[PDB]
Design a protein around this motif. Structure first.
Motif, PDB file in Angstrom:
ATOM      1  N   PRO G   4       0.821  -1.205   0.000  1.00  0.00           N
ATOM      2  CA  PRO G   4       0.000   0.000   0.000  1.00  0.00           C
ATOM      3  C   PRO G   4       0.853   1.253   0.000  1.00  0.00           C
ATOM      4  O   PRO G   4       1.993   1.248   0.501  1.00  0.00           O
ATOM      5  N   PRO G   5       0.349   2.355  -0.555  1.00  0.00           N
ATOM      6  CA  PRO G   5       1.078   3.628  -0.487  1.00  0.00           C
ATOM      7  C   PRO G   5       1.056   4.242   0.909  1.00  0.00           C
ATOM      8  O   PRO G   5       0.577   3.611   1.857  1.00  0.00           O
ATOM      9  N   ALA G   6       1.568   5.464   1.050  1.00  0.00           N
ATOM     10  CA  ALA G   6       1.929   6.022   2.349  1.00  0.00           C
ATOM     11  C   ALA G   6       0.839   6.929   2.909  1.00  0.00           C
ATOM     12  O   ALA G   6       0.408   7.878   2.246  1.00  0.00           O
ATOM     13  N   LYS G   7       0.426   6.653   4.145  1.00  0.00           N
ATOM     14  CA  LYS G   7      -0.469   7.530   4.888  1.00  0.00           C
ATOM     15  C   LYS G   7       0.335   8.708   5.439  1.00  0.00           C
ATOM     16  O   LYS G   7       1.501   8.911   5.093  1.00  0.00           O
ATOM     17  N   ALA G   8      -0.279   9.502   6.311  1.00  0.00           N
ATOM     18  CA  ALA G   8       0.339  10.731   6.780  1.00  0.00           C
ATOM     19  C   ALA G   8       1.214  10.493   8.004  1.00  0.00           C
ATOM     20  O   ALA G   8       1.200   9.427   8.622  1.00  0.00           O
ATOM     21  N   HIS G   9       1.974  11.526   8.357  1.00  0.00           N
ATOM     22  CA  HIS G   9       2.868  11.521   9.506  1.00  0.00           C
ATOM     23  C   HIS G   9       3.393  12.932   9.716  1.00  0.00           C
ATOM     24  O   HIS G   9       3.501  13.711   8.764  1.00  0.00           O
ATOM     25  N   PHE G  10       3.715  13.252  10.965  1.00  0.00           N
ATOM     26  CA  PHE G  10       4.482  14.455  11.241  1.00  0.00           C
ATOM     27  C   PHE G  10       5.954  14.233  10.908  1.00  0.00           C
ATOM     28  O   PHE G  10       6.424  13.101  10.761  1.00  0.00           O
ATOM     29  N   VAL G  11       6.683  15.339  10.773  1.00  0.00           N
ATOM     30  CA  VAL G  11       8.138  15.310  10.658  1.00  0.00           C
ATOM     31  C   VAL G  11       8.683  16.554  11.355  1.00  0.00           C
ATOM     32  O   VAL G  11       8.499  17.675  10.870  1.00  0.00           O
ATOM     33  N   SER G  12       9.335  16.359  12.500  1.00  0.00           N
ATOM     34  CA  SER G  12       9.806  17.476  13.305  1.00  0.00           C
ATOM     35  C   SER G  12      11.078  18.071  12.712  1.00  0.00           C
ATOM     36  O   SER G  12      11.844  17.395  12.021  1.00  0.00           O
ATOM     37  N   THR G  13      11.290  19.361  12.984  1.00  0.00           N
ATOM     38  CA  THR G  13      12.391  20.115  12.394  1.00  0.00           C
ATOM     39  C   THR G  13      13.313  20.731  13.437  1.00  0.00           C
ATOM     40  O   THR G  13      14.083  21.641  13.112  1.00  0.00           O
TER      41      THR G  13
END
Lengths: 123, 51, 50, 106, 50, 167, 23, 196
Positions: G4-13
């Motif tokens: 399956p393709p990719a669901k969402a997620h945060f990415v901290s900076t």
RNA sequence: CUCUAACCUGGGUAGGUCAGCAUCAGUUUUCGGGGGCGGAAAAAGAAUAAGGGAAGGUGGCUGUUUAUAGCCCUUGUUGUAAUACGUCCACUGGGGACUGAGGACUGCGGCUUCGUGCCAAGGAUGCUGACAUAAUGGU
RNA sequence: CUGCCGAAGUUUCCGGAUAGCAGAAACUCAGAUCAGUUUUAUGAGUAUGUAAAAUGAGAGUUUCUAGUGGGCCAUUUUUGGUAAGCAGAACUGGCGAUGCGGGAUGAACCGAACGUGAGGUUAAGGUGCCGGAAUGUACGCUC
RNA sequence: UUGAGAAGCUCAGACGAGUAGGCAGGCGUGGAGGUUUGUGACGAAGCCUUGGGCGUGAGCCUGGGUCGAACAGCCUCUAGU
RNA sequence: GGGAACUGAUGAAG
């Protein structure tokens, strides 16, 4: 139902207007050299099944009653139960006496005779 | 049966025949008021107005 | 059941878009025109044909 | 004759057409003073005519008339697209019509 | 059917409400947020059969 | 029209690379589907992260904070010529960064007949000092005693009754 | 069966600040 | 916004190829156009610009019975009449019936001196041309190719102006009387509140 | 007695074509009206408190720092702001255009008002007007 | 007279064949039996072929029987080439059987494949007149 | 509710160029058997027509004029069609 | 120094 025609100008065989040997009844052209066969635009049209008319308002006169050749006095009798969907067209070779008796009886059956007036001058 | 294709967007009777929810929609619910707060971080506005 | 439901509906036969397409149609959408992915702008295309 | 003229002067312009195919079942009409396809929404629906004068006289006069109405705006210059009970003859290009103000909705 | 519809209609908002919420958090925080991707696509033809 | 988009992104993290770097671009795009297509164009030529490797994380618009204040923009352009070699610096005087690059494209479309993909804009900075403006004509619309008569005047309905004033 | 393709997620900076590039 | 049965278009200051296109549509529209002072039309480009563009047209004749070749007309009126002849389908029955609605003359004959002379605001030189441009005047041009009637019309038109000027002062003195009589009617000043 | 039926006496009552106009149904086009929901919880801006800076330097005296013009920048505040843009309404006023196929009731529905019935709900009906030394229709 | 289905125009051997394309019946199987298709996996030195996922669609068997082994071009490799063309091998399509809008008229160009009509909306291409549609809006060019 | 020429009636979808070729339904001409209690000197066949009608079409029906002895529809058979 | 209907004679008619 109001009668309608998909076409009113009949079809007229190609170049049957120029030459007097070629008659006006339609004949599909047979050569692939033809402009008409390949259906070039500007040339005349053709009889196809597209111009077929309504399957219920077919064979109807513009009034709405279909025709029926009555060639004697017992051919108009069958039209007793069909006086609102048929018009008693008298045949052409019927004498000018046997004609005047169909009219006087079709009038009792309420049937439209289309050409009752032929050979019949009234006084 | 089904002589005409009625349109349930422009006809308001066939819509109720197909969808038994048109008697309660409330498409516009006031989920906010005057007191809406700004949520704009400083470091996001710094990377926004950078360059 | 999305496969078993997408086989139910017919292909959606639409009309030509009221207001036309863009100017020249068969180049990729990202240089004007309209072809390939439109992302959210396929929305504003169906609000023309329908 | 200034206590008359309850219509609007117009001019039949041309048939509907492409470059090579003309469609004589629907006309093009240029109303006077209508100079925008948003100002042509006022004359949508009015019953236009085309009055002329034949030689042979029938029913105590000579003037005949072809009625019709107006269906669409046409272009960006305030022309419209009309539709007559009998299609207008092609020898009436650049003639004058009358756009009668009824059915009036104003 | 309405009992299913009430569940669906409130759910469309309740997933549209959160992507309003889940971006209002990150943008006010300095965090970033990829979205739940498109999983449905809608394909409309542009050229004929020639 | 045009709309300037802030774009950032990265690649897919692996076990070898748990945290990919984040790359910010301030570019111009009439909508957002061409921004996230131009974004992978610049980043492929510079950072060599292909479209089959990277992903896009955030798109936002930058409205001009002071659209009512007149400004002057110095414009750095890398232009891809028929020899593919042009670095260009050009000044435009207007109010909005959205509006400058439209005029930048238009002039660049006339004298040097540049297309969409033939242009890669490099840097846009609101130049402010009067002594750094290096153009004669831009300088002259900035003297306090400026003035001019109206150009391109022309003040349907054919058949005018009298002569136009044209003054 | 497909991956399956990719669901969402945060990415901290906080450890990875977005740098600004130029073409 | 004019559907006059006859319009008179004074042509001083107009362009040739833009007036000949405005007129060509109004001919097919059904009007009856008269173009006076056709001699003082203008053409974009300097004096020799159309001059070799028409001296080239003189080099073009048939090579069979050269009295059957092209008829290169030299009058300023027929210069512009030529311009409204290719703009119309003059090989049909609607072209050659439109062309007889157009009367293109030079100067101003007295049958059109005493009438209104409208102008076209979409074909004028002071509008459509950049200031400080090169332009040539047809009646000043066609004289150099054979129209030998320049010194007469420039003399004739000068007489008409001073006569028309004398007409104007009598007309100007006429409404100065009614200028007083308009406000002298007291009803104007208290009942101007209907806009007038 | 029943029935039909000639006469005298009375009352009501097309199909044919062409025009309207109305409430509708289908397709469609063009004006709007209202409100939600989103972005820097749009950016502006306005009004009002700070500080900073200067100019294409104003009053003042070519040079200077708001004075007898003002400008820019940062923050506070009026803000719990407006608009715009992108959307969404099973939200609403109209205007034009072409079509009327099908032919008792069967069905899905909504209003009811508890008997029902009614309805824009499985394809149009109604209210009038012109006409037979005729309006349309043909060839 | 009308309606329905409708090709090849290249092989493979030896004018005869076989196969193919189009067809008629009989008889199979509602399945993983397929698919001018895309994935994932194995390998192989971005490409190569192999197997079981997506996507669509009902597939298959023989029997007996017509027409057809012309070419014109456009596509990219391509070696031999040179004053300059070019000559040749392979792939793909069109056209042959195809009318229609543009391209001013043209088969090789751009759109689009056709029952009879009404109403709408578009492609290509266009909106100064011929010619139906802005002498529209914006910014820069040119004597 | 009658719409059972079950070779009829009826409901719903998709489709519609077409060469060589393949298949199907029909139109018309001369003779033959059967049929129309068939038409005809009050005018058969034919012919002409700025008349009307039907069928997509091959074709057919008809009004008017001309004319003067024969002729057609339906179901089959047949071809010097 | 190079290239490769035509003219007569009557004539009706706004």
């Amino acid at each position: 139902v109001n009668i309608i025609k998909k076409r009113t100008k009949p079809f007229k065989r190609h170049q049957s207007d120029r030459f007097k040997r070629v008659g006006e009844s339609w004949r599909k052209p047979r050569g692939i050299d033809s402009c008409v066969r390949r259906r070039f635009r500007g040339t005349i049209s053709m009889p196809k099944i597209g111009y077929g008319n309504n399957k219920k308002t077919r064979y109807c006169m513009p009034n709405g009653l279909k025709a029926f050749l009555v060639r004697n006095v017992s051919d108009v009798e069958l039209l007793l139960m069909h006086n609102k969907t048929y018009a008693a067209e008298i045949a052409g070779n019927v004498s000018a006496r046997k004609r005047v008796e169909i009219v006087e009886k079709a009038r009792a059956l309420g049937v439209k005779v289309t050409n009752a007036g032929a050979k019949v001058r009234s006084q | 049966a089904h002589v005409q294709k009625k349109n349930p967007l422009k006809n308001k009777a066939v819509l109720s025949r197909l969808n038994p929810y048109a008697k309660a929609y409330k498409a516009n619910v006031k989920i906010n008021s005057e007191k809406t707060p700004k949520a704009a971080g400083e470091k996001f506005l710094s990377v926004l107005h950078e360059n | 059941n999305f496969k078993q439901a997408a086989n139910f509906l017919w292909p959606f036969k639409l009309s030509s878009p009221l207001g036309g397409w863009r100017e020249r149609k068969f180049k990729h959408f990202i240089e004007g025109g309209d072809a390939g992915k439109r992302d959210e702008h396929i929305n504003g295309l169906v609000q023309k044909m329908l | 004759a200034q206590g008359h003229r309850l219509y609007v002067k117009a001019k039949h312009l041309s048939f509907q057409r492409s470059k090579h195919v003309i469609h004589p079942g629907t006309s093009i009409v240029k109303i006077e003073g209508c100079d925008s396809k948003e100002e042509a929404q006022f004359y949508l629906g009015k019953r236009v005519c085309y009055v002329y004068k034949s030689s042979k006289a029938v029913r105590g006069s000579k003037i005949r008339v072809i009625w019709g109405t107006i269906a669409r705006p046409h272009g960006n210059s305030g022309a419209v697209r009309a539709r007559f009970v009998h299609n207008l003859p092609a020898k009436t290009f650049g003639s004058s019509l009358r756009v009668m103000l009824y059915p009036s909705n104003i | 059917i309405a009992k299913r519809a009430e569940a669906y209609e409130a759910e469309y908002r309740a997933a549209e409400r959160e992507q309003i919420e889940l971006a209002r958090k990150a943008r006010a925080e300095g965090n970033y947020f990829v979205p739940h991707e498109p999983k449905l696509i809608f394909v409309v033809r542009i050229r004929g059969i020639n | 029209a045009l709309k300037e988009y802030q774009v950032v992104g990265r690649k897919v993290p692996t076990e070898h690379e748990p945290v990919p770097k984040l790359f910010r671009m301030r570019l111009f795009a009439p909508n957002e589907s061409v921004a996230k297509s131009r974004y992978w164009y610049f980043l492929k030529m510079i950072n060599k992260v292909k479209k089959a490797t990277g992903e896009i994380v955030a798109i936002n618009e930058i409205s001009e904070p002071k659209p009512l204040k007149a400004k002057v923009f110095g414009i750095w352009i890398r232009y891809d010529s028929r020899s593919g070699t042009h670095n260009m610096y050009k000044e435009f005087r207007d109010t909005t960064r959205v509006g400058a690059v439209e005029a930048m494209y238009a002039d660049m479309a006339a004298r040097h007949r540049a297309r969409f993909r033939s242009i890669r804009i490099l840097k846009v900075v609101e130049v402010e000092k009067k002594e750094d403006v290096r153009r004669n004509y831009v300088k002259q619309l900035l003297n306090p005693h400026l003035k001019f008569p109206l150009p391109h005047r022309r003040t349907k309905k054919v058949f005018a009754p009298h002569r136009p004033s044209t003054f | 069966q497909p991956a399956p393709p990719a669901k969402a997620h945060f990415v901290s900076t906080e450890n990875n600040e977005p740098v600004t590039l130029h073409p | 916004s004019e559907f006059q049965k006859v319009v008179v278009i004074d042509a001083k200051g107009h362009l040739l190829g833009r007036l000949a296109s405005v007129v060509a549509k109004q001919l097919l529209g059904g009007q009856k156009v008269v173009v006076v002072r056709c001699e003082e039309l203008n053409i974009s480009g300097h004096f020799f610009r159309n001059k070799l563009k028409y001296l080239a047209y003189l080099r073009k004749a048939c090579r069979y019975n050269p009295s059957r070749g092209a008829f290169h007309f030299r009058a300023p009126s027929r210069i512009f009449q030529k311009a409204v002849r290719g703009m119309l389908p003059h090989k049909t029955a609607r072209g050659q019936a439109a062309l007889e609605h157009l009367q293109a003359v030079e100067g101003i004959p007295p049958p059109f001196d005493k009438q209104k002379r409208v102008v076209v605001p979409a074909a004028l030189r002071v509008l459509r041309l950049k200031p400080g441009r090169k332009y040539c005047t047809v009646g000043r041009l066609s004289s150099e190719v054979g129209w030998k009637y320049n010194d007469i019309v420039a003399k004739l038109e000068e007489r008409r102006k001073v006569k028309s000027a004398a007409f104007y002062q009598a007309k100007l003195a006429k409404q100065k009387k009614i200028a007083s009589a308009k406000e002298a009617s007291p009803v104007n000043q208290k009942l101007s509140q209907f806009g007038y």
